[PDB]
Amino acid sequence: ERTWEILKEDESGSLKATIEDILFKAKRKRVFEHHGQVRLGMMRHLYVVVDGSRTMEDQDLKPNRLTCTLKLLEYFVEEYFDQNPISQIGIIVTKSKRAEKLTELSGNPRKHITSLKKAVDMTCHGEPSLYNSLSIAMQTLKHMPGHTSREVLIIFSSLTTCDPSNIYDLIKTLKAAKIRVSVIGLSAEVRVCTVLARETGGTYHVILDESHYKELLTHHVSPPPASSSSECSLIRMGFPQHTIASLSDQDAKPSFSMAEPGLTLGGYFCPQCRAKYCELPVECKICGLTLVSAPHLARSYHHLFPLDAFQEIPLEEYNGERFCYGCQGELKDQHVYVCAVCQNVFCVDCDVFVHDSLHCCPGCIH
């Protein structure tokens, strides 16, 4: 007997029209987090584990957990490749006390997202089997090279899981295998997953809101840190140049990529096996030599030397120009950002866009 009277004017005079001013911070956000100059698992094999159990039908979020999960998964899949084309993805669904590898080890969002679209039709059935899921995953990761960061991300919806044997078998194996596992839980903290994640070197987090769900996923987009226990390798890599059918396709037959059915007349050949690949980067399914484009390498070098947060202040007390450096414009906002090194004037968009998207400060390049 309180909801029709729950407005701010229920027991106040000024709240009759200042109610949305008193409760004005109702829907906003402001994303930022820390960083560190530590080794990163730039070569990344991340596998996604998603509950396929009846509990995924619950409406803890706006739509059922399944729809909200798949919605954010697609977005996460996109940015994961976008921020690391070198890495690869795979998906496993934990249904009927069993686990089904929705997607194999690959780096093609086309196939991965296509699988998601189709996976929207899945049937939430039975209880989850964390042991079966980790079995299929580890069985696959066993064959992956030690230097490639073998990681798994788990999305847990239920609280009870059917394991055919104590998961300590897998955790002891995973720890010895140096594989890393992280888990994202829905509405609750489970000891099983917490111990599993903390012991395995990953982290257990719980979803609060779709924004929090993105906030957590955002952290998993950045490559994990690496220790000296992982193989510090000197992996062989190919940088094949694109080659069209320039000579009227002469002595250059069109061919389908190892992964694709599209017969491409021009593209990237394998310097190791001369295979035809329409896209790059692509792993040589018939050689083991990975082929990567020179710009994709530089695309990740920001993680090696990222920017630092700029000095924030409510006013340009330093009395720089009335026009914000970088992007020209008036200091219309009573909050200013100043680079520690170059000390130029930066605005809200500069601190956000330059540090989170440009990753380079103009005055530091000078």
Partner 1 sequence: PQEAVPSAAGKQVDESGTKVDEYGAKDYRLQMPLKDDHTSRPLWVAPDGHIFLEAFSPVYKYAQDFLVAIAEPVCRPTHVHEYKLTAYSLYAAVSVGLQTSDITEYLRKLSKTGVPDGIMQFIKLCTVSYGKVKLVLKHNRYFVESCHPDVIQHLLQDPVIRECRLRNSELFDFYEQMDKDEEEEEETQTVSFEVKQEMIEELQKRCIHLEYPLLAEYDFRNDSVNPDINIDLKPTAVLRPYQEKSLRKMFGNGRARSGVIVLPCGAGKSLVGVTAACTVRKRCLVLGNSAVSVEQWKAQFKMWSTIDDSQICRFTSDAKDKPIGCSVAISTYSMLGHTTKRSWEAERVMEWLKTQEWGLMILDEVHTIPAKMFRRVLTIVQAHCKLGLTATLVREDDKIVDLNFLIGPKLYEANWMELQNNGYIAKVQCAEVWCPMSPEFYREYVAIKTKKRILLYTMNPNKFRACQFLIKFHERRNDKIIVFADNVFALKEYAIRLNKPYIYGPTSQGERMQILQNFKHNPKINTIFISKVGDTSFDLPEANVLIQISSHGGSRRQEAQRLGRVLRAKKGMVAEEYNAFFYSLVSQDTQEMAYSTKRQRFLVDQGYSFKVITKLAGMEEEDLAFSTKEEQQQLLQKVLAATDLDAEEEVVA
Least Å distance, CB 145 to partner 1, is 42
User: Binding to partner 1 by residue 122, rule CB under 8 A?
Assistant: no
Least Å distance, CB 339 to Zn ion, is 3
Distances (CA, A) of 240 to 58, 138, 275, 290, 323: 49, 32, 11, 10, 46
Residue window 262-291: x/- pattern of binding to partner 1, with contact defined by CB under 8 A = ------------------------------
- Gap between the Cα atoms of 279 and 262, Å rounded: 10
Please give the residues from 235 up to 294 whose contact with Zn ion meets the rule CB under 5 A.
270, 272-273, 275, 284, 287
Nearest to 252 by CA among 269, 238, 240: 269
Sole window of 1-9, 194-202, 215-223, 244-252 interacting with partner 1 (rule: CB under 8 A): 1-9
- Gap between the Cα atoms of 345 and 354, Å rounded: 12
Q: Which is nearer to partner 1, 95 or 355 (CB)?
A: 95
Residue window 6-45: x/- pattern of binding to partner 1, with contact defined by CB under 8 A = xxxxx-----xxxxx--x--x-------------------
User: Binding to partner 1 by residue 5, rule CB under 8 A?
Assistant: yes
User: Binding to partner 1 by residue 3, rule CB under 8 A?
Assistant: yes
Report yes or no: 50 and 73 within 8 Å, Cβ to Cβ. Answer: yes
Sole window of 3-11, 38-46, 200-208, 273-281 interacting with partner 1 (rule: CB under 8 A): 3-11
User: Binding to Zn ion by residue 232, rule CB under 5 A?
Assistant: no
Task: Note the residue count of the chain.
Answer: 366
Site size for Zn ion (CB under 5 A): 12
Nearest to 154 by CA among 132, 175, 169: 132
Sole window of 2-10, 48-56, 74-82, 246-254 interacting with partner 1 (rule: CB under 8 A): 2-10
User: Binding to Zn ion by residue 361, rule CB under 5 A?
Assistant: yes
- Gap between the Cα atoms of 14 and 18, Å rounded: 6
Binding partner at 270 among Zn ion, partner 1, none, C-beta below 5 to 8 Å by kind: Zn ion
User: Binding to partner 1 by residue 252, rule CB under 8 A?
Assistant: no
Least Å distance, CB 129 to partner 1, is 25
Report yes or no: 98 and 123 within 8 Å, Cβ to Cβ. Answer: no
SS3 letters across 173-206: HHHHCCCEEEEEEECCCCHHHHHHHHHHCCCEEE
- Which residues, at least 6 apart from 104, have a Cβ–Cβ distance to it below 8 Å? 90
Least Å distance, CB 127 to partner 1, is 21
Binding partner at 272 among partner 1, Zn ion, none, C-beta below 5 to 8 Å by kind: Zn ion
Residue window 324-353: x/- pattern of binding to Zn ion, with contact defined by CB under 5 A = ---------------x-xx-----------
User: Binding to Zn ion by residue 363, rule CB under 5 A?
Assistant: yes
Q: Which is nearer to partner 1, 27 or 34 (CB)?
A: 27
Give me the DSSP letters along 123-181.
---S---HHHHHHHHHHHHTTS-TTSEEEEEEEE--S----SS-THHHHHHHHHTT-EE
Give me the DSSP letters along 196-239.
HHHHHT--EEEE-SHHHHHHHHHHHHSPPB--TTS------EE-
- Gap between the Cα atoms of 88 and 239, Å rounded: 18
Q: Which is nearer to partner 1, 61 or 324 (CB)?
A: 61
Helix (H) or strand (E) holding 297: helix 294-298
Least Å distance, CB 249 to partner 1, is 43
Binding partner at 339 among Zn ion, partner 1, none, C-beta below 5 to 8 Å by kind: Zn ion
- Gap between the Cα atoms of 105 and 91, Å rounded: 8
Task: Kindly list the residues in this chain that would bind Zn ion in the complex (CB under 5 A).
Answer: 270, 272-273, 275, 284, 287, 339, 341-342, 361, 363-364
Task: Kindly list the residues in this chain that would bind partner 1 in the complex (CB under 8 A).
Answer: 1, 3-10, 16-20, 23, 26
